[model samples]
Target: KEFQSVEEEMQSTVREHRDGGHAGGIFNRYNILKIQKVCNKKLWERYTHRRKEVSEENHNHANERMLFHGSPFVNAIIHKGFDERHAYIGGMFGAGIYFAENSSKSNQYVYGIGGGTGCPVHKDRSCYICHRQLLFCRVTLGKSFLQFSAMKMAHSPPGHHSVTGRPSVNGLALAEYVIYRGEQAYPEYLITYQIMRPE
Candidate 1:
């Protein structure tokens, strides 16, 4: 059970979670969105710290942290494993879900979770992929690339919001979400909508 590093293993799982081709029709209509997940060491530490803080105050914080964000560790792993040219990043921490696009704007590097927003959501929950179409849908949007101009330019904000627009107005509504307390990775999700919504 000791597959490669925890990072690699986690990332591999994320890839699978994002794959939803099994659903038949849904997969076809929403094909083309290939998004890679991201994570870092900090992501893991924060996830652990917030999940089991020893104080009531810390506990509250843990809950809020879980509300909207995922471990940088997981994010880093997902990022590392992503195919930057073909995928967009998507995940839910709690009430908040992060849907980021990769950018080739930089000569330095590029991949999933690429953007300027430092407020990337962190969570302790595991990444889940209900169908392969989700990946296809993201790819259909466009290949997320950090342009050389954007990265080279000074004071350039990471283009997180401008691109990956919400799916609600598009008619892809959140059907349900089931949130589970004390669970790692979007613990509060109780129904399907939780996974579908854009917020």
Candidate 2:
């Protein structure tokens, strides 16, 4: 009888831990799906508008910026859109996906040649990392509809430097994620733009 009682107690303990562990309800599948759906809508609307403005060939040829490291996916779910107000709104508080262009590249004349004076950059805390996997769902999506791994960013003022001359940690001026599929051209390129507090 004592042996049986001890066995029952062990089972109960394990059940309690599993049910009320630290990661218990936080890792729910249903909640994750709902969040992903909202992100999809925001990303799609942005890209849809940009395709109409410039031809894929023209933009692709003009792009001279070297693809940076850590771009895991050719196509991901989380993405970006154009800078104009018609299709996409500006700022973190504003509606639509915020898009910013590269001013450092001289040849890239597709959009605002210099720093986009009219539309200042907005700071959003939520950031995404992209990857080419079926972690979200099995449903096949377009090249632009890629998966993005979400991340948290630190927001700080511009030109805010560390002990060194360079900008301080958490002070990100701007970052862009450019994704291109095999043999795909300009419009096919999935681009995401993130900007810090603009000058």
Candidate 3:
């Protein structure tokens, strides 16, 4: 009964926020993105055996160019999670999906979310293995975030377009995600992809 009530309340609050959006307080865009990222990370970990490296470079999004990007895959996953409020909160709040301002250059988008300490900006230096892979996934505190980058194939000239260079072309790129689970430690997601435009 308690769980059901909690779920119901969450559902109601989420729906209300979905329609009108939260202005301030704990339920604002930041926390919404945190919840969405964490939930989606859990969902992804359930299916794959991937782990991330932990280092100061990784902590500061140094290898952000390696993130995944694909339009079809991104839309598909977003569609799959449409009904799951927790999974799609980022989408609901207009942060889950992203489009590059210019399709000719490399673009980077980071989707970081979670709870407790070690958030996106945590200063602690630590790393953990994804449990499904070898050691751990998820954390009690710290930062857990996903990064998506898009690089267009420079196969064609500006006016001359090819399928690969078209904005509508389907593309998926690898994402470099960092997950902070403990007060002094965090984990990185080895492989994750998001949709992006090709040009």
Candidate 4:
């Protein structure tokens, strides 16, 4: 009963966040089949360490924040967590692991299974592994530095643990956050679902 309820809540949040973006709306609808909660005690230890470190250092946002990270290949992160050196995209802000608050933004990078979009046509609803990897992550963004433009640095600026980039591009809001340390993040949930775009 507890497990089923957790999934329902996760599904509701994922489903409710899709209406605003055309790429997430006019084109596709998401149906989640499962949500797997991932736990890494080692990661939890280091993350909590950094959390207290920043709070003691008097950083404004020393708490954990929930964000989205979606990728066609995400098992590596599920096990070992994020590494900026292996990132495929150029660092728009800093050279760190990226995460987003918007579902559509996370969906943008998910190229899906079979080198296609993750949202498969609804052939079988009972399927278990109709997998499109989306991670709901808890990030300890202790002491964040705000910047709107690109930064080619390896880590956040002095005295900060993470970076936040929020620049309006032609009136579009696609803000993203990046954290330099692998310990600052933990993959909270792995969701497998199908996205059906309008034909």
Top candidate by TM-score: 4
**lDDT by residue for model 3 over 59-84, one digit each (tens)?**
53322221222121233343232112
Task: Tell me the spans in candidate 3 whose CA falls farther than 4 Å from its real position.
Answer: 1-38, 44-49, 52-68, 79-199
lDDT of 4 by residue, 1-199 (tens): 6446544544444433323433333323466677888887876777677777777776445767888887655788877767666654355764678788765467656653212433455433222235566788888777778877777667778987788887565422567888877777888888776655445
lDDT of 1 by residue, 107-155 (tens): 0011123222222243111112332111100111111223221121111
Worst 10 residues of 3 by lDDT: 126-135
RMSD of each: 16.6, 20.3, 19.0, 5.2
- Runs in model 1 lying further than 4 Å from the true structure: 1-39, 54-77, 80-95, 98-175, 178-199
Worst ten in a row by lDDT for model 1: 102-111
Considering every candidate listed, which one attains the maximal lDDT? 4
- What lDDT score is found at residue 85 in candidate 1? 28
Model 3 gets an lDDT of 0.22
lDDT of each: 0.23, 0.22, 0.22, 0.65
Runs of candidate 2 exceeding 4 Å displacement: 1-30, 34-53, 56-96, 99-170, 173-199
Sort order, lDDT high to low: 4, 1, 2, 3
Instruction: Pick out the ten consecutive residues of candidate 4 with the lowest summed lDDT.
Output: 18-27
The C-alpha stretches of model 4 lying farther than 4 A from their native spots are 1-28, 59-61, 112-130, 169-172
